Specification:
This is part of a larger assembly, with chains A, B, C, D and E. Chain B is mainly alpha-helical. Chain B is 50% helix and 10% strand. Chain B has two domains: 147 residues, Ribosomal Protein L13p, Chain: A; 50 residues, Single alpha-helices involved in coiled-coils or other helix-helix interfaces (Up-down Bundle). The longest helix of chain B is centred in the C-terminal third of the chain and has 35 residues. Chain B is elongated, with a radius of gyration of 22 Å. In chain C, a hairpin with a 4-residue loop joins strand 4 and strand 5. Classes of the chains: A alpha+beta, B mainly alpha, C mainly beta, D alpha+beta, E alpha+beta. Chain B binds two RNA strands through strand 1, helix 1, helix 2, helix 4 and helix 5. Chain E: Its main location: cytoplasm.
Chain lengths: 136, 197, 106, 109, 171
RNA sequence: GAACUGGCGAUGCGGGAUGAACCGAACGUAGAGUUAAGGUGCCGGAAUACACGCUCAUCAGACACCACAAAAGGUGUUAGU
RNA sequence: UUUGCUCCACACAAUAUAGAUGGAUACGAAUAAGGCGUCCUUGUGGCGUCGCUGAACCAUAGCAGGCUAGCAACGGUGCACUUGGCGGAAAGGCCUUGGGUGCUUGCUGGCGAAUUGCAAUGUCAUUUUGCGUGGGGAUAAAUCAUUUGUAUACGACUUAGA
């Protein structure tokens, strides 16, 4: 046989790692880590989403599974160019994380008539699903 | 938000859980705490045994019967830590404390109900990895609790029955998820997806 | 339907107090759902009713109401200050209470 | 007198022609057009209670015909506008209530 | 507080025996202009025979960072008073600007030596322009090629007092 | 036992758990707002806030007056010369 | 002890409420790891996916929720039964078979609502007791007094007596 370990990988922080700003003035946009200050804080830049180039504590951002190629210390023109080339914005939008965010804000933006409409549609869908729950 | 909140005491810190729960009772929420033998106290087992022996020394000199009572069960240790944080000598404190019952294990009124956790009192979220902690059941059976093994046997039986429940629940939810996926991509499904559901 | 509630539930926590002196003229209300003063600013000026029961029928009912209103926010966690026509009887610490949506401004 | 003239319509949910206070309603975003309704007939003197004397005490225990055909005139003009967009008749017939987990400071009406 | 850097230029009051004094200049990290001018007069009373009544301040100007988005390594030379004596220290900090570097320096001295703002004297702060002149291991650790590391044990703070599932610390 | 000033005695109120003198502030009867000194896990009104570090004690430590600890040591650990 | 006691159904009174107002919605273990799905040689296995909070899920339209007509399905749900299990930690609950009956907003119609007058909790919950009905069910002991002495200041204790 062969040796087996559980690898247990998680989300390294390095240059080119895409992060989501959790709280602050941006608070929900994407950025790319440009360089690492120390153990607790990094220099990021989010030039497509309008995040200014700044040093930020690592507790204020969430690391995403997205990575792309950057040299360390890259200026914002190169950051925007490589971001557009790797095309990570729709790669983020294709994830179920961003779909969950969009679902949450859509449900927040519903009105009372739309809530009545989703109640009627959910009753119709529940009727056909519980009808399907009688043959298997 | 709930009539009764059932808290699984496993992996929780005693003081932080007690300060959450005492404020919940004083605000008027009914709390029942199950699995009190699996609470955690930060620090070495020898430190907390020495702390309990220092507490156990204290008694009224002329009559030990009217002194401080040193209760030995883990639930009563938790009750002591919580009665310290409720002003129990007033009518408001008594009315708060009668909204609480704490148990070792999960009794049959509550084994079929839903258990919650308190994330600001959980040991894995509060302590630094590397700090040493204790188990309240081990400390309590070291200082004189007699029923550590019967609770373990009852908990083993309850876990067997609960796994038998969960297998059927998982099979049913896989059937329901399959039917929901096959009944998706219809017109009502796309309208609900446009409207956010 | 099965629900007819047109109010928001809240809890009567305590009076306005220092460490050792309380003031029964101002009550403290925990509205459920709100956890910040910026969300609690929506509920300012709303009417509050404490609804309780009695054994003796007075004017066709055995249910008596005490009316008040939200005046300001309290603290950092969405507790509000409330004033009533007659102050709340202090045995209702932890009792449920109703925050209506009128006077409205939406 | 700073009051809002409202109607159900009476065929939909049984609410007649009435006046309400503006501080006791919620203005939802749902909008229908009421052009084609002649509401200038109604005023503050149109709703009179005919105040009761102190002698007339109800120990134990009707409607204006002018009011009932005024209601029948206006509601048939409203429901023609209601039939354009779907589910408005059902929406107006159903009642509003707060469910568990509804936060009115976050809800948009 | 959150520090700012000022240049403060002052001189002695002009007399008939000597007009145009020599216009001394110093760089001060301070919270505002008042504290900056107070620290300026403090260090000039330590250096030359002058005081505030006998002198004047001709200019104060805020010097903000030239490249606030370049990551630098700074070497800082510091005097501090301990409980028994006065010592000189050299600490080096990897950070993005001078004011933030001296803010973390003040926090570091207050944390590790219990030295207060009244006890710390900032001799100088200078950017180390070349690597391998870095002499401390805790900052030389972050200068390696393709630096990457994970963040184990994620703790997410909750808004509700009750959670309905056992949380995970995967990151 | 003296010197200068401020107090208590003669003085309640908020804080220091508690206390004549300490801190804050001196007082007609009420309403609203803002604060001082002190605090914001629970008792207990108010952030289980944010940020950088340090410490694990088989007698930890936790706030002026104030309710104690020294000389001498320790490849415990951290930062320096 | 002049028809008393208990249980069941509703009928009316009284009595209060530490505080209903859609639903307490059930794996276990780990956290420097897991959950779910799938496949196999069934393992400390391979592959895929998810988390980043319950901001969820279920439920939710009708006189505080009426009276009726039809369509489509053979589903969903309530009530009283009924068959079979399981549950002793404080089981007093969970699951299931069969038929009955009511509703169905899955879809389309017809009639009603006003006047509580511009708001007034605008009254709908459960806790205990009594008294009436009418329908079952069963026909005791203890204490004082007398006695005992394994007991005893007195009470108390231990005995006996149709």
């Amino acid at each position: 046989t062969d040796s087996i370990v559980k690898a247990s990988n998680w989300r390294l922080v390095e240059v080119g790692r895409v992060v989501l700003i959790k709280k602050g003035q941006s608070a929900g946009k994407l950025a790319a880590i440009v360089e690492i200050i120390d153990q607790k804080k990094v220099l990021i830049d989010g030039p497509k989403a309008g995040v200014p180039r700044q040093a930020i504590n690592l507790g204020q951002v969430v690391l995403t599974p997205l990575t792309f190629a950057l040299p360390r210390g890259a200026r914002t023109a190169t950051v925007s160019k490589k971001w557009a080339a790797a095309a990570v914005c729709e790669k983020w939008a294709a994830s179920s994380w961003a779909k969950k965010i969009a679902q949450r804000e859509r449900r927040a933006a519903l009105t009372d008539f739309e809530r009545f409409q989703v109640m009627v549609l959910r009753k119709q869908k529940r009727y056909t699903v519980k009808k399907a729950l009688a043959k298997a | 938000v709930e009539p009764v909140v059932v808290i699984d005491g496993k992996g929780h810190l005693v003081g932080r859980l007690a300060s959450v729960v005492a404020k919940q009772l004083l605000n008027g929420q009914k709390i029942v705490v199950v699995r009190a033998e699996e609470l955690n106290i930060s620090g070495e087992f020898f430190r907390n045994k020495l702390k309990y022996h220092d507490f156990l020394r204290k008694a009224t000199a002329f009559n030990k019967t009217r002194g401080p009572f040193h209760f030995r069960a883990p639930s009563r240790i938790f009750y002591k830590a919580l009665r310290g944080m409720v002003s129990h000598k007033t009518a408001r404190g008594k009315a708060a404390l009668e909204r609480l019952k704490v148990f070792e294990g999960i009794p049959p009124p509550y084994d079929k109900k839903k258990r919650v956790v308190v994330p600001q009192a959980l040991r894995v979220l509060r302590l630094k990895p590397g700090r040493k902690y204790t188990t309240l059941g081990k400390l309590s059976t070291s200082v004189g609790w007699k029923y550590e093994d019967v609770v373990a046997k009852l908990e083993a039986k309850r876990k067997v029955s609960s796994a038998e429940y969960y297998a059927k629940k998982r099979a049913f939810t896989k059937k329901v998820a399959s039917a929901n996926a096959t009944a998706a991509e219809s017109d009502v499904a796309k309208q609900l997806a446009a409207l956010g559901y | 339907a099965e629900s007819h509630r047109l109010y928001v539930k809240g809890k009567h926590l305590s009076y306005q107090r220092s460490k050792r002196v309380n003031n029964p003229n101002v009550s403290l209300i925990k509205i459920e759902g709100v956890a910040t003063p910026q969300d609690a600013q929506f509920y300012l000026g709303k009417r509050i009713a404490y609804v309780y029961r009695a054994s003796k029928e007075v004017r066709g009912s055995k249910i008596r109401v005490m009316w008040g209103k939200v005046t300001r926010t309290h603290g950092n966690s969405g507790v509000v200050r409330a004033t009533f026509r007659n102050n709340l009887p202090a045995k209702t610490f932890g009792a449920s209470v109703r925050i209506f949506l009128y006077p409205s401004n939406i | 007198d700073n009051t809002l003239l409202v109607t159900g319509p009476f065929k939909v949910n049984g609410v007649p022609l009435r006046r309400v206070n503006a501080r006791y309603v919620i203005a939802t975003s749902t909008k229908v057009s009421v052009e084609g309704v002649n509401v200038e007939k109604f005023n503050v003197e149109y709703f009179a209670k005919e105040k009761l004397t102190k002698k007339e005490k109800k120990e134990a225990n009707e409607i204006k015909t002018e009011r009932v055909e005024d209601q029948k005139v206006v509601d048939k003009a409203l429901l023609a506008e209601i039939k354009k967009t779907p589910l408005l008749k059902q929406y107006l017939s159903a009642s509003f209530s707060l469910k568990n987990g509804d936060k009115p400071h976050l809800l948009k009406f | 507080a959150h520090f700012k850097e000022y240049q403060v230029i002052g001189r002695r009051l002009p007399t008939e025996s000597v007009p145009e004094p020599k216009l001394f200049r110093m760089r001060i990290f301070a919270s505002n202009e008042v504290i900056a001018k107070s620290r300026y007069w403090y260090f000039l009373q330590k250096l030359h025979k002058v005081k505030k009544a006998s002198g004047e301040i001709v200019s104060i100007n805020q010097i903000n960072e030239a490249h606030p988005t370049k990551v630098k390594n700074f070497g800082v030379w510091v005097r501090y008073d301990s409980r028994s004596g006065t010592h000189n220290m050299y600490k080096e900090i990897r950070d993005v600007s001078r004011v933030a570097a001296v803010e973390t320096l003040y926090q570091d001295m207050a944390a590790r030596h219990r030295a207060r703002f009244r006890s710390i004297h900032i001799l100088k702060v200078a950017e180390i322009e070349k690597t391998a002149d870095v002499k401390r291991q805790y900052v030389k650790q972050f200068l390696t090629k393709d630096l990457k590391f994970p963040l184990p044990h994620r703790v997410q703070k909750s808004t509700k007092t009750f959670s309905y599932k056992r949380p995970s610390t995967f990151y």
